[PDB]
Design a protein around this ligand. Structure first.
Ligand SMILES: [Zn+2]
Lengths: 100, 107, 93, 84, 79, 99, 81, 93
DNA sequence: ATGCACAGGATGTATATATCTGACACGTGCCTGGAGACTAGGGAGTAATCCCCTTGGCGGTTAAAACG
DNA sequence: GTTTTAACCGCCAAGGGGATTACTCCCTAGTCTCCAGGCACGTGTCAGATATATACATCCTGTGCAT
């Protein structure tokens, strides 16, 4: 008769949304992002040294842009009477934004 | 006689002399009007006071004695004119306004 | 060397509006960045206006027009009032 | 002669005071059996009118239409072929 | 070398949550990886351009600030 | 003895083809000028206008409207629809940044 | 000068949408289009009049419209440059 | 009075690439406006570059950097090649 | 047996309180950048001219708008 | 498909202001001299971080009432 407790689908999601719409700290791991940045900074020049402040500013800007894109994608998916986002929503959002 | 700051003459807190020097060295025009730096410093001081007031209100609402970038972001995004002014401005560690769409709420 | 900023003036303005509220370093760094951004925007627009009318001098009228063009509604009106009052006070003094 | 107090609509007060979604039917059947002795046909209407706000009388859109030369004015007034 | 896979799905989920996203498809993650990569190229190219014109070998934060500013994405808090 | 009417939509496609090849203005000039002067009345009275200015406003407005219509069409199609809804326009303008 | 925004007739908006690639159009669109167009026109004309007044002029030139459009991030070619 | 434009040089280039092709006045003005806009973009970017580096001169290096920043890919590369070639030719002659 | 309405255990969140720290605020020397004084000459303000360009109107056609 | 209107064209006319030109003048760039406002630097607290130990507030499933 022993049952394990578990919330219904969509509860932990709302809890996380509330949690992360309140905090402001960065969400991406520092080292993987730094390694990705350095790898990208090789097809323009080799042996590129980096101030830490540049890396953190890049992370801030990238995360802000990604969050804004996520919110636009959410609006696009909601407009399609859905709660799940699929990449066509991202494509439409970037197309309307003029990125495409 | 004794030197008197032009800001005091205009009754401002922003350094009018520094503003005038920067205007001269900013390659904006050959000549700079005498009443220009005063006007610019006054406008800057007014905007600074406005946003500082809003940020202090936000910090008090968080029961904190010091304004943090989160307070600045909240004040800017909450003020319609200020948000429109800084439409394309990204604030570091500012976070976002807590907002959840209605349809995602449990029903 | 020494680098100048707006820290002291922003601090004084804060003490005028909130005589008890402190501030962190990141906040006043953002403050200085915002001040510089507004300064450059207004100065560039004023220079554009002056070149538009074939004039070699930047006066307070140019800044008034630039502020009217850059700030929305009530902010623009209030800033115009502040600039006019400060100019009149300085000229009278 | 202002009431000087919390004023609510007839529908508003009905929905704010007697709002028993489970036991509304109980009150309906209570009124129905109360009126069953004399007037059972009109019991439901006698109950329901207390759930509605005051209104201005209007013809029910088919007394008007049997006469083609009759039209309703702006504020519900009567208008005919002599209106200009 | 697949640092694009350094962007794990928990981080993408966290960013979506801060973005107010509730339900996420499985195909989303790679799309975000690609879009983020494109953004990174666009910024970093200009950043390196600025670093080179200054005849420097170390990229400064001010270079990134200028690159973001000229792309219409103003950033504060760094100079 | 039949009216010989075209099906709903083929005429729309034909006029889409017609108007995607032309370049002339699609709005009557006089009403546009009247509206422009009416709007300008609220900023300063007794304002005169160069004709090239009114043409400039008409061209810019029509181009902006065409762009907005194109975005709205994509938004509505994303909803798997064929008819344009005002909610599509509102979403498009919000995404652009105008809202 | 009153009630001119009705001057943009429904066929005009229809043609605009057809050039925009729209095939089927709802009837409750036209007033929304008129409102958005009014907002855009107001935003442009405000800055155009500001430019005209700063020059102490009484007629609005196309070149003022060019500057106003440029400042709003909508550059237009072919009207003086 | 007299107003100047890029009309004659545009017509020269048109005859260079398409010797048998005419041009309307409105299109001609369109190219004039386009050239003006590109001029402003490059000049402003070069000025910002000079100010950032604390320099008093606008040299060809700054022009090349601005061209790289403002032009997409192959356009930037070909324009850089053309500018370098023209500079070399002028310096030699 | 079905839609509603409580009871309650689980659970994650918010409060209360105690401690420690480094981050902010404050005090000090100095020096260089702003202030005060003086000049000249040119950019800007002012006055007179004109004529072009803006506005305004009136009549006729009809394409386009309106309507069902 | 049928009916209505006002956009548009042409043609004309009057005048307002924007462009032009000449003259003047005062305002700002330029120069020198002087001094204190702001900045780099050093100390000292206390706002907030951090840790722990309790009230809440929901989530959610298991009860009944009865239709
Ligand atoms: Zn009521």
């Amino acid at each position: 008769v022993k049952k394990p407790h578990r919330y219904r689908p969509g509860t932990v999601a709302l809890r996380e949304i509330r949690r992360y719409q309140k905090s402001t700290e960065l969400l991406i791991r520092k080292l993987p992002f730094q390694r990705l940045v350095r790898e990208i900074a090789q097809d323009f020049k080799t042996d590129l040294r980096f101030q830490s402040s540049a890396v953190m500013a890049l992370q801030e800007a990238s995360e802000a842009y990604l969050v804004a894109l996520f919110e636009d994608t959410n609006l696009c998916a909601i407009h399609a009477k859905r709660v799940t986002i699929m990449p066509k929503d991202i494509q439409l959002a970037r197309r309307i934004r003029g990125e495409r | 006689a004794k030197a008197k700051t032009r800001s005091s003459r205009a009754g401002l807190q922003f350094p009018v002399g520094r503003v005038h020097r920067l205007l001269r060295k900013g390659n904006y025009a050959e000549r700079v009007g005498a009443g220009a730096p005063v006007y610019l410093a006054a406008v800057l001081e007014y905007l600074t006071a406005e946003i500082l007031e809003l940020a202090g209100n936000a910090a008090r609402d968080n029961k904190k004695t010091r304004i943090i970038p989160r307070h600045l972001q909240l004040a800017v995004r909450n003020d319609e004119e200020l948000n429109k002014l800084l439409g394309r401005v990204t604030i570091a560690q500012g976070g976002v306004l807590p907002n959840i769409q209605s349809v995602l709420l449990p029903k | 060397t020494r680098k100048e900023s707006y820290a002291i003036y922003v601090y004084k303005v804060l003490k005028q509006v909130h005589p008890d509220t402190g501030i962190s370093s990141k906040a006043m760094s953002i403050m200085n960045s915002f001040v510089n951004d507004v300064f450059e925007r207004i100065a560039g627009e004023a220079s554009r206006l002056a070149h538009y009318n074939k004039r070699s001098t930047i006066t307070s009228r140019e800044i008034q027009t630039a502020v009217r063009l850059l700030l929305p509604g009530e902010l623009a009106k209030h800033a115009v009032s502040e600039g006019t009052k400060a100019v009149t006070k300085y000229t009278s003094a | 002669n202002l009431p000087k107090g919390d004023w609510h609509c007839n529908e508003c007060k009905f929905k704010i005071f007697i709002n028993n979604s489970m036991a509304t039917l109980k009150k309906i059947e209570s009124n129905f059996i109360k009126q069953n002795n004399n007037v059972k046909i009109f019991a439901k209407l006698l109950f329901n009118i207390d759930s509605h706000n005051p209104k201005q009388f209007q013809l029910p859109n088919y007394i008007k239409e049997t006469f083609p030369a009759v039209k309703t004015g702006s504020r519900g007034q009567y208008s005919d072929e002599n209106d200009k | 070398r697949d640092n694009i896979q350094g962007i794990t799905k928990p981080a993408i989920r966290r960013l979506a949550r801060r973005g107010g996203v509730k339900r996420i498809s499985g195909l989303i993650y790679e799309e975000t990886r690609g879009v983020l990569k494109v953004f990174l190229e666009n910024v970093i190219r200009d950043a390196v351009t600025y670093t080179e014109h200054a005849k420097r070998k170390t990229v400064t934060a001010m270079d990134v600030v200028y690159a973001l500013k000229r792309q219409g994405r103003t950033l504060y808090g760094f100079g």
